[PDB]
């Protein structure tokens, strides 16, 4: 039983969809999002003016 549990943990870790994937994705999107915020904000300021 212990063996099955440990192996299962490994197989789960080896799922293609993985923590690493989300981490990577997040880092990319984060950078994009921050830049987008700055960008569009400038245009909105101009719109109010």
């Amino acid at each position: 039983q212990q063996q099955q549990a440990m192996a299962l943990l490994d197989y789960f870790s080896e799922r293609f969809t993985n923590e690493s994937l989300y981490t990577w994705l997040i880092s990319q999107l984060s950078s994009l999002y921050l830049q987008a915020y700055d960008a569009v904000l400038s245009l909105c300021l101009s719109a109010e003016a």
Partner: protein
Amino acid sequence: SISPRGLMKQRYQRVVTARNASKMNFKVPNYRFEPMLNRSKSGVETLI
């Protein structure tokens, strides 16, 4: 002899929600307000 064990303490946690704001102004741009509105709304939606 034996004695019972006290139940572990639990507590709420405060959450801050104050916010600051800053004033801004900018010079008149090249484009009319409604074009600007269309552009801006598109961008805003994308960001959201």
